[PDB]
From Swiss-Prot, chain A:
Location of the Sm domain: 1-69
Protein's name in the database: Small nuclear ribonucleoprotein G
Matching Pfam families: LSM
UniProt miscellaneous comment: Present with 1400 molecules/cell in log phase SD medium.
Sequence similarity: Belongs to the snRNP Sm proteins family.
Organism expressing this protein natively: Saccharomyces cerevisiae (strain ATCC 204508 / S288c)
Intracellular or extracellular location(s): Nucleus; Cytoplasm
UniProtKB/Swiss-Prot annotation, chain D:
A GO cellular-component term linked to this record: Prp19 complex
Part of the intact protein present: 44 to 108 of 110
Keyword Cytoplasm: yes
Further information: Present with 799 molecules/cell in log phase SD medium.
Name this protein carries in UniProt: Small nuclear ribonucleoprotein Sm D2
Subunit structure: Component of the Sm core complex, present in spliceosomal snRNP U1, U2, U4/U6 and U5. The core complex contains SMB1, SMD1, SMD2, SMD3, SME1, SMX3 and SMX2 (Sm proteins B, D1, D2, D3, E, F and G, respectively), and is probably a heptameric ring structure.
Originating organism: Saccharomyces cerevisiae (strain ATCC 204508 / S288c)
Main location: nucleus
Annotated Sm domain residues: 1-65
UniProtKB/Swiss-Prot annotation, chain F:
Record's subcellular location: Nucleus
Highest taxon of the lineage: Eukaryota
Function: Involved in pre-mRNA splicing and cell cycle control. As a component of the NTC complex (or PRP19-associated complex), associates to the spliceosome to mediate conformational rearrangement or to stabilize the structure of the spliceosome after U4 snRNA dissociation, which leads to spliceosome maturation.
Subunit structure: Belongs to the NTC complex (or PRP19-associated complex), composed of at least CEF1, CLF1, ISY1, NTC20, SNT309, SYF1, SYF2, and PRP19.
Protein name: Pre-mRNA-splicing factor SYF1
Membrane-spanning ranges: none
HAT repeat residue numbers: 17-54, 69-100
Annotated signal sequence range: none
Sequence similarity: Belongs to the crooked-neck family.
Additional observations: Present with 2170 molecules/cell in log phase SD medium.
Interval of the full protein contained in this chain: 156 to 287 of 859
Swiss-Prot record, chain G:
Note: Present with 861 molecules/cell in log phase SD medium.
Domain remarks in the Swiss-Prot or TrEMBL record: C-terminal extension may function as a nuclear localization signal (NLS).
Organism the protein comes from: Saccharomyces cerevisiae (strain ATCC 204508 / S288c) (Baker's yeast)
Residue span(s) of domain Sm: 2-77
Homology family: Belongs to the snRNP SmB/SmN family.
Subunit-level organization: Component of the Sm core complex, present in spliceosomal snRNP U1, U2, U4/U6 and U5. The core complex contains SMB1, SMD1, SMD2, SMD3, SME1, SMX3 and SMX2 (Sm proteins B, D1, D2, D3, E, F and G, respectively), and is probably a heptameric ring structure. SMB1 specifically interacts with SMD3.
Protein's name in the database: Small nuclear ribonucleoprotein-associated protein B
Lineage, opening ranks: Eukaryota, Fungi, Dikarya, Ascomycota, Saccharomycotina
Top-level taxon: Eukaryota
Function statement: Plays a role in pre-mRNA splicing as a core component of the spliceosomal U1, U2, U4 and U5 small nuclear ribonucleoproteins (snRNPs), the building blocks of the spliceosome.
Subcellular location: Nucleus; Cytoplasm
Length: 69, 81, 82, 65, 135, 113, 78, 70, 75, 81
RNA sequence: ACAUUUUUUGGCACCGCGACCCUCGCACUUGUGGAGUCG
């Protein structure tokens, strides 16, 4: 029901720890009540970027640990 | 509404511990919690399932992937229940 | 329509229950929730090639219970009536 | 009718009940699996008189005429 | 003051500094605890023999201070200030046990008491609050 | 009896010894009834023997055990009381199933319908 | 243990608790949920590595019901 | 313009194949619903691209599905 | 803020190279062009291509990949 | 509460506390950190005051894990008390 | 009172143990000396 308060993390680069012991990086552009994430693109953790912007599904997110403070 | 949720909310401010499905325990000041246990935490250490530990700043965790949360024992006293 | 109702109607039955992790559970169903959370009494947990562990009271969760093995004698049509 | 299941159980049985979740009350029940710790090859099956079933288990039901 | 079911049911129950029950001449009727305790405190009682227990799978700590234990019929066993007098009376502990305390028992002053315990109860790692060492 | 209950939670000959030792008396008869019900062979008759070590209902259990031994059970029924309806039930079991067993009960009953 | 109807009626009893990962949480149920989440008063996680019981005292714990398998009664109140 | 549900509707009485959470399938689609549970005829079980058996008339549960294809 | 639904819509409008990751499945990915949109994450994606991940290329037709097993999008 | 110092700081914290509990249970129903500041020390809290006094007199200089422990009454009252 | 992402329609299944040495300190605890060897 309530919105995930990620307005602190808006327009900052975040380590999206994602399903299956994987990772994603990138600057936060948006989100919704299901915790889907819209982010301006970055690499999959040696390293290799795919995409210009990226959208991560809600279910898939383990964590979204902030790279910037 | 859920009393565990309420408890979690109350624990805001306090240093909660927090393990996930992965089995990666965290400890930190609980910044914010929601009805779905969508926890944020500050000044947080992060243990790997195998053993090794890593310091980190402001972790967010989605309650779906959370397993169990340890709250400080002062909250036992009052006045939610 | 609802199997939940049927489950509810099944009371005081000494039954085996099978879980998603394969644990065989011999006990008397004292009650079941609307969401299939089984509440047993006189319970007996055995695995599917190792020794047994008995317990007085077990509240098993609805998501875990794969198959509840029903009793020997049971009138099903009657049960299925609203 | 036969049912395929998440845990490798071919449930050959007579259907009694049916709902939104695809939970089923079953009579004349005959499951088929294989208790086997590798390398080994065994094919096992047991009769059960009456049996309730949960729906998340069900992958694909089928009807052999 | 028999150790009875009624006695156990009104006994202080708490989480210690493990689940512990706060507790007599003879140890009996433990069935009523229902195997729900990690620790049982039997200090300051008049028990003569450490015996009479039902099957208790939980029970990991037994504090039996200041009783009259003279014979023995589990990870920690504290028997301080009791009546065990002969090295051979400690033999039944070989069948259990990592923390053992037998201080203030006459048996303590017997020649070779420490080495005897170490060889006959090798599973003990700490004896009388001192590390069992290799030497 | 609570120790017998905890021991029951813990729960064959030695176990039978522990149970018989565990068996106020009405609860023990209820336990023997629990044994007669749970066993529903010869071991149940042994439970009846332990029950003897512990009456018309016991005779009914003896009927469930079903021939001279049954006559011995009838002798136990005679031991149970000098005489009122339960004795008539004993004569009834005697008549329903040894013609002398029925004729004797008919004689004691004799002691227009 | 007593012969209860529901979980709610047996509040504050010392509880064994199993979870999908195989750990065993033991402690007094302070509060229940619509989704079977449990508050435990004095919680001890007991785990078994692939041998013998490893033990950890936690404290006051909110425990999510998703991960909960089944609950058993360890002892009476107090 | 083409959403999924309408596509699904269109594809009734036509060949389809389904992967699972894994084994491939192959059969003619009978009907579908909002939850994306399936009912097929002439079902063939492609065990990683190997038609192990031909079952015929089947009903696939939605949550085990991975994707639909012609 | 840019919502996910909005992003999806934009992608659809565009018709661009989309590379989807599978939930709880590392080794495989999908690569195609978004055609459909749903209330949930489910979409239809014509001219799709299955990819084995670098720890080549494989043939694949038109597909709807179900919303529950999606992970990543990019377009 | 009694304050103990001169303790062998090589014992792991949970083992130290459990032996401390065991040893001191003989006098009545019964805090230790390994920080630089607090290592080799412990505060043992008893329900009864007579128990604390008896413990102090009887275990003064008791060899524990190799060293003679030094016991004293704590400076302040324990939060729990 | 009801199944399509956060709970119950599941992604299931096939620091410690030997050695050495540092610290004598009045607390409320993720954890706690350091060098070196073993796992």
């Amino acid at each position: 029901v309530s919105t995930p308060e990620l307005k602190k993390y808006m327009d900052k680069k975040i380590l999206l720890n994602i399903n299956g012991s994987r990772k994603v990086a990138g600057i936060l552009r948006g989100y919704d009540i299901f915790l889907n994430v819209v982010l301006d693109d970055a690499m999959e953790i040696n390293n290799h970027q795919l995409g210009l912007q990226t959208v991560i599904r809600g279910n898939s997110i383990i964590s979204l640990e902030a790279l910037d403070a | 509404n859920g009393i565990p949720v309420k408890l979690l909310n109350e624990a805001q401010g306090h240093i909660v511990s927090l393990e996930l499905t992965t089995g990666a325990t965290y400890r930190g000041k609980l910044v914010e919690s929601e009805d779905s246990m969508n926890v944020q935490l500050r000044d947080v250490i992060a243990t790997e399932p195998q053993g090794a530990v890593t310091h980190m700043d402001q972790i967010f965790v989605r309650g779906s992937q959370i397993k169990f949360i340890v709250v400080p024992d002062l909250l036992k006293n009052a006045p939610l229940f | 329509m609802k199997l939940v109702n049927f489950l509810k109607k099944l009371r005081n039955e000494q039954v085996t229950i099978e879980l998603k992790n394969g644990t065989t559970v011999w006990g008397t169903l004292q009650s079941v929730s609307p969401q299939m959370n089984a509440i047993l009494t006189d319970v007996k947990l055995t695995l599917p090639s190792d020794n047994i562990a008995s317990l007085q009271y077990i509240n098993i969760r609805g998501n875990t219970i794969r198959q509840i093995i029903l009793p020997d004698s049971l009138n099903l049509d009657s049960l299925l009536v609203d | 009718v036969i049912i395929s299941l998440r845990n490798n159980h071919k449930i050959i049985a007579r259907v009694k009940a049916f709902d939104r979740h695809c939970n089923m009350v079953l009579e004349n029940v005959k499951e088929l699996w294989t208790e086997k710790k590798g390398k080994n090859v065994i094919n096992r099956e047991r009769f059960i008189s009456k049996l309730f079933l949960r729906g998340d288990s069900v992958i694909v039901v089928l009807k052999t005429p | 003051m028999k150790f009875t079911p009624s006695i156990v049911i009104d006994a202080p129950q708490y989480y210690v500094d493990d689940l512990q029950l706060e507790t007599e001449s003879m140890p009996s009727s433990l069935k009523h605890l229902t195997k729900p305790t990690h620790i049982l405190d039997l200090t300051n009682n008049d028990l003569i023999m450490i015996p009479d227990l039902s099957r208790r799978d939980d029970i990991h700590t037994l504090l039996l201070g200041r009783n009259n234990i003279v014979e023995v019929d589990v990870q920690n066993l504290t028997l301080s200030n009791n009546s065990i007098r002969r090295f051979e009376d400690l033999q039944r502990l070989r069948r259990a046990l990592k923390n053992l305390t037998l201080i203030g028992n006459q048996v303590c002053h017997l020649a070779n008491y420490r080495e005897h315990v170490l060889r006959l109860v090798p599973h003990l790692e700490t004896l009388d609050f001192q590390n069992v060492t290799a030497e | 009896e609570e120790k017998v209950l905890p021991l029951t939670q813990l729960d064959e000959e030695e176990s039978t010894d522990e149970a018989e030792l565990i068996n106020l008396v009405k609860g023990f008869t209820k336990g023997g009834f629990i044994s007669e019900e749970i066993s529903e062979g010869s071991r149940g008759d042994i439970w009846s023997s332990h029950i003897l070590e512990r009456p018309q209902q016991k005779r009914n259990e003896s009927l469930a055990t079903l021939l001279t031994r049954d006559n011995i059970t009838i002798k136990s029924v005679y031991e149970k009381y000098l005489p009122d309806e339960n004795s008539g039930k004993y004569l009834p079991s005697s008549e329903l199933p040894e013609l002398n067993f029925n004729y004797l009960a008919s004689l004691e009953k004799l002691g227009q319908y | 243990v007593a012969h209860s109807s529901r979980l709610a009626n047996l509040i504050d009893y010392k509880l064994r608790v199993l979870t999908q990962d195989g750990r065993v949480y033991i402690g007094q149920l302070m509060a229940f949920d619509k989704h079977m989440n449990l508050v435990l008063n004095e919680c001890i996680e007991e785990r078994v590595p692939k041998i013998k019981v490893e033990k950890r005292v936690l404290g006051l714990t909110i425990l999510r019901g998703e991960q909960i398998l089944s609950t058993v009664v360890e002892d009476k109140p107090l | 313009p083409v959403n999924p549900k309408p596509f699904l509707k269109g594809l009734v009485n036509h060949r389809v194949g389904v992967k699972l959470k894994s084994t491939e399938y192959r059969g003619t689609l009978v009907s579908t619903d909002n939850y994306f549970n399936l009912q097929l005829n002439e079902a063939e079980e492609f065990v990683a691209g190997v038609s192990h058996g031909t079952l015929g008339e089947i009903f696939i549960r939605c949550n085990n599905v991975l994707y639909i294809r012609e | 803020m840019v919502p996910p639904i909005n992003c999806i819509f934009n992608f659809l409008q565009q018709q661009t190279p989309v590379t989807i990751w599978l939930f709880e499945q590392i080794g495989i990915r999908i690569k195609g062009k978004i055609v459909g949109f749903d209330e949930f994450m489910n979409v239809v994606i014509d001219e799709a291509v299955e990819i084995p991940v670098n720890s080549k290329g494989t043939p694949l037709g038109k597909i709807l990949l179900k919303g529950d097993n999606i992970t990543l999008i990019t377009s | 509460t009694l304050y103990v110092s001169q303790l062998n700081e090589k014992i792991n914290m949970q083992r130290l506390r459990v032996n401390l509990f065991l040893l001191f249970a003989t006098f009545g129903e019964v805090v230790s950190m390994n920080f630089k500041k607090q290592r080799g020390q412990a505060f043992i809290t008893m329900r009864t005051i007579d128990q604390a006094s008896l413990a102090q007199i009887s275990l003064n200089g008791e060899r524990f894990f190799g060293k003679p422990l030094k016991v004293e009454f704590s400076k302040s009252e324990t939060k729990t008390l």
